[model samples]
Target: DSSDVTEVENYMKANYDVPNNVYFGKAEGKNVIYVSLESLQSFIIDYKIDGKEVTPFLNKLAHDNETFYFDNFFHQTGQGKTSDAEFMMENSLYPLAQGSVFVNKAQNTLQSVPAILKSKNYTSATFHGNTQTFWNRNEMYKAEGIDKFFDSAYYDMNEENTKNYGMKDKPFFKESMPLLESLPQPFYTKFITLSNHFPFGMDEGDTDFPAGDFGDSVVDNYFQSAHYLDQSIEQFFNDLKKDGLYDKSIIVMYGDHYGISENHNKAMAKVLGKDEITDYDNAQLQRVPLFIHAAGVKGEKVHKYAGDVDVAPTILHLLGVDTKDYLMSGSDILSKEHREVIPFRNGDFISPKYTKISGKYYDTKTGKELDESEVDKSEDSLVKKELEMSDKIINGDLLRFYEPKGFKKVNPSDYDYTKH
Candidate 1:
């Protein structure tokens, strides 16, 4: 009738191996600010449009000395899209195959980053310019142990200030400043931007950047909106510096999901300058921008092959949190023993040595076919088992059975986002 706690615990014990390496506690006690950039792709970092850079400010940060820009990182989103991206980074768990965990299983009891930090006396909150219940995020935040939430109710959301999904990127960043300053010290906060969402709408006078002319409106609009988001981030960084929050915080900026559709290959081919987009190209297109700026770390363009599932533990380790008792599906990317298997929720995965797409294994370096004997077939079941275990935990709320030391149990009923 109920989930078998012993089985789940044993399964997790066998699959998850949390390492304590030399990089442990590197930025302990520092504030964490995560900016979940919408629909941003790795291509736009240094990409040019009409002989001018499309994202000048993003380019500066990608190559700057203060940021560790992940060149080979991929988004592990499935049917949940943006919300799934958030869930993976926060809990290191895969989203449900059908819908976002935020909307589908918001009441699931679990240990996410916010709740873990809460045990250490760190207050956490999330800021979004959309309606609080848009993705059922209000409920999800409560389940995740977020201390506060700043939704559209906190923002002045007249028609002129919004687009596509919700608030425009520029005003959203500028408007979130006051709410950010209101948080307690050594806090954890997340900013979800919406200006660069699909349909990629932009007011005529919104930005000076030129849009792409790909003969497809969808593809062309993507360029315009991405540039707008870049400018907005620059404004947000300036505000972080203008106020007192800049140097003391560990800033993480990442793309939530892919901006363009795979069906838009004809238009995308023009952007990538390809004769034709292949399955390999499509997999590579999943690469998203993951930039982190921390005080104690040296900024370098890392070519490590990892995904959002692996990043939660990465950030946790950077903050000096041990994840041995946790059920995270992936390992810390900042470790020498990092498992290179980057899994997508759809059962496809990749690594520096081997890549699998559509159940066919290819040499990642050459994109050539490989026989089953030449590949480690264990990874196939490994990825499948990982997703299934997470699905079980999320659907069954299995974490309620295990209690780790120094961590408080999450009671979804206790927190209320409607208080505002």
Candidate 2:
């Protein structure tokens, strides 16, 4: 299980400097970084502390920043893993199928987060510590409007990646360094860390970062990789500070999904002394830690149930950009608002033929299994309405964010600026 938090102030630091005109710059704002953690679960039992049961890095980030710890989110794709998080984050759609979100069919097609920024004349690029074509992210980014993308093909430690998992940090340091340093001021970059992937630990033979508190231990090796990623991230942020962009930048980091390796889960189960996992079930796969840090935001903890689908809308809200024209399927959690239900994965919604909440199952389309004695007769009408809503969302006939009152787009020239 994760470390027992012991105790905390449970509030933002009082008497601490809040800084006036905190984000000094154009009203439009500069960079926004989206860091996606790979295969992370918040089931408490998935944590390791000290030399045995410790806390994951993301957990720490959440506690120390303007974090929103969504305790009830679920990944509906069941087994889509990384694709599930990516889909919900970028397109506000849950993975309705059992494959990748990048390759799935969507009801409303629009430029993703990157494209939204591009429309405002912002320079956009995507960074990954792995191969570009894994989920066709390379092409997918292009389709979604990213200005440039970095992957194994463009930067690496060798000609063909002789190692098993991925390229060495040389690509991250040597290659990524120069590119990041060269990016135009006020540009946005997305960096996805890879050291935390399966076949854990570092490269087959590469060396640089230490093994930290985790080594060959089941799943701990994965934590070791996360430690490695944390080191690189700190370096990147320090670099940005040195480059005179730290104060003006926005950093958002969250895990992509829970680690699904058999050994990893087994180790986690052993540490927590429980078997709290959801191989592919949406209810079991959606909870993750999310942190948003930058100027003008109070460093406080937000205990709300949110998912990756909220990423785009949240960012758009933070940037003061109108997302009226975008097909955003999620709501902005930062608005201190609550939605009855937040969609996850690739907008898969839910089936009317199944139960909606915990410990309940009913046909979604048939107006909530009337003959089932298990269902409470007092709530029959309420269940029927929810069933209808679920049916429309799943049938791809549902429209929320960009339907009915689609707004007109502002002229591109109004916000024209040089891009990297």
Candidate 3:
């Protein structure tokens, strides 16, 4: 596979160029916290249900002058769903079509966030309220160079503290504070929440928000569960502040995947007050909220056509890490030379002017479907080639042939997560 590796190297050198020092060192040497909000969608940012805001804290965060709210960001996930999002955000690569990289390809050599930040002498760990083996994250995290893995075993597991997925968000976030505080300064950590997942439910005492009359159980219950999740997040922020980690950190919060799948399109149409759900409507639901807040940065809502793949490069750039040598398929969204095309895992792509999916093209501005014959061959071919190259990189493990300078390959057996 020498030729395959060379092909990827040449392609990355020519196309993956990002601007230097655009927002470099803005959050340098600061602690980083990435929170994965389960099943959150952009449509609920400021939306009201039964005359009350579903997520008041998130609504304020979206509108605050200290946060960067991405209104046009989409979730480009494959069958892996949330794990796929995690894969892309951590490695700037697309997930496989048939299965999760976390499950099937965890042993492959990966240049992930934990490993990259470790090169900068930063301690890294992942905190989740679920079992370490839920998605085989124990092995995957070890392979990703995470120094510590805090799963359900790390916290008290009792009737009141546990729920369907694992620990309740309230106790999970509440108990995670001490462990987070225990990590050394300038650490990189990720918190994965489970309260807002599918079949969204909450304890009666945990929710005061009223449900809407959407007539669909899932859709109606979604609002209540989301509110509970929001409350849990707010409390986490408060704990962070009390522990004096809030202002000293660069906080990132994003929705992992779609809450309601296409199966509930009919009922969701009623909730969205749409006459009928169309392909465009379904495409629009792909939009998920990405919020980045820090003390020094000025907050503004960005309308960039980007996805989770672009997240790693953007953060790495801001932290003063030069990515010219890395074979990342994503560009820094904040860079002046950032690419405008957003590619989905299934070969679909969304650009500012057009959307191409499943052999058809449409106007993104007007939602008017266009004839396939009218598509521009150059742009379409570029998008398809990019997608193919990413698949080759993942499926063939091309990077193992040519390691980037100053990068160390992870040994899966070097770290253990058996206890956590």
Candidate 4:
């Protein structure tokens, strides 16, 4: 029924089907803990307010010997934003442009991380402190092969603790510990935080973290929200240690999307001390922090370019699973053969050498924009082809016809998000 299915099949057979290297199976039998940091950006890594760190725990984790801190990672999202990043990291497919793939394509067959882990006898669960139906995650999660979902209904959400989104980060993480402990061994668990989201707000009782001098309400309170989120993460990590899940788990944490959109760019300019915001600055703002921590792995800050799409393959490789049969757009980040070119959701791409955004080219090494006509023809073609292929694969739903080896197509009817 689709003309592009053959191309997708050929593409899958040709790449991402190779064997692993030294990092392969490093976390083979350990539990996987993924923490989705909402609206957090890379610039906050060591940012200080009055010489006080915004995210002290995360900053320490980023520099710890066991963490692979990806400094060049970018958030590639479309209209779906956080949901788009979620799907990309889980399935390695691009999100739909007009709406969230979660809501628009809930029933589409997927070979997501949970599904792959399920085949390996790993139980998977998602812990979110919001209404399960907000992004239609209740329906889409079923197709992602998640075994159990604990949303706001499953938590002790109260008027004092909840706000615009859901429960505040501290209580949300506090409440989620027991549920996380109850999951079966070798589990794939995800925790989604909410306090740092847009229109950043913090409870009066949370902390005395000061607001920035950016003269913008959103920008000023941004630091405060991040501070609160950081304190909550510290508490959660302490609880995780107490529960004995800290050392035994391959813990992953990444910012889902940008907290400050272009609407706040002027204020952001003041925050960054920039005289004027350039297109290049706007593009660079897409950077989001990603860190993977586990024991026994020699960790260093990775300089290689990566994005949300690369996460699934990277995780699978670390778990020692072969991904040759899966139609994934990303390669293992730790592998030597990993693709260095990073593409955004809107047909823009960047590599170590160059960046092509909105038909314009910029030198990645030096922040200088280049003449459109003077750009390398081959580089342009490479970026175009990569983006086009990703589009074809998603638009045609090609994975339905070529299920990966050991992968089982998720049956939507088998899951009940509400039953929990």
CA lDDT of each prediction against the hidden true structure: 0.84, 0.51, 0.84, 0.83
Tens-place lDDT per residue, model 1, 196-245, is: 87788689899878889887888898888898888888999999999968
- Runs in model 1 deviating more than 4 A are 1-3, 14-22, 371-374
From the highest lDDT down, the ranking of the candidates is 3, 1, 4, 2
Rank the candidate models, highest TM-score first.
3, 4, 1, 2
Give the poorly placed runs of model 2, Cα more than 4 Å off. Answer: 1-28, 43-48, 51-60, 65-80, 104-108, 159-165, 168-174, 203-220, 261-266, 275-286, 340-420
Report the Cα lDDT for residue 360, model 2: 46
**Over 4 Å off in model 3, which ranges?**
20-22
What is candidate 4's lDDT per residue for 51-158, written digit by digit as tens? 989889889988877788999998888889878988987888888867788888887778889889987899999899999888888888888988989999977788
Worst 10 residues of 4 by lDDT: 12-21
RMSD of 4: 1.6
Residue 256 in model 3: lDDT = 91
* Between candidates 1 and 2, the lDDT winner: 1
Candidate 4's displacement at residue 252, Å, is 1.0
Whole-model alpha-carbon lDDT for candidate 1: 0.84
Q: State every prediction's TM-score relative to the real structure.
A: 0.95, 0.68, 0.97, 0.96
Comparison by TM-score, 2 against 3, better one: 3
Candidate 3 on 1-420: residue-level lDDT in tens?
A: 767888888888899756646376787777889999999998889989867999999998988877888999989888888788888878898888787888998878888877888778888888999888887788778878888889998989898887789888889999899899999877989999988888987778778999877778888889998998899889999898898898888888999988988888878899899878787778888889998886566656888788888988888877778888888888887887777778888877888878876767889888899987776767777777778878889899887886877788877687877782
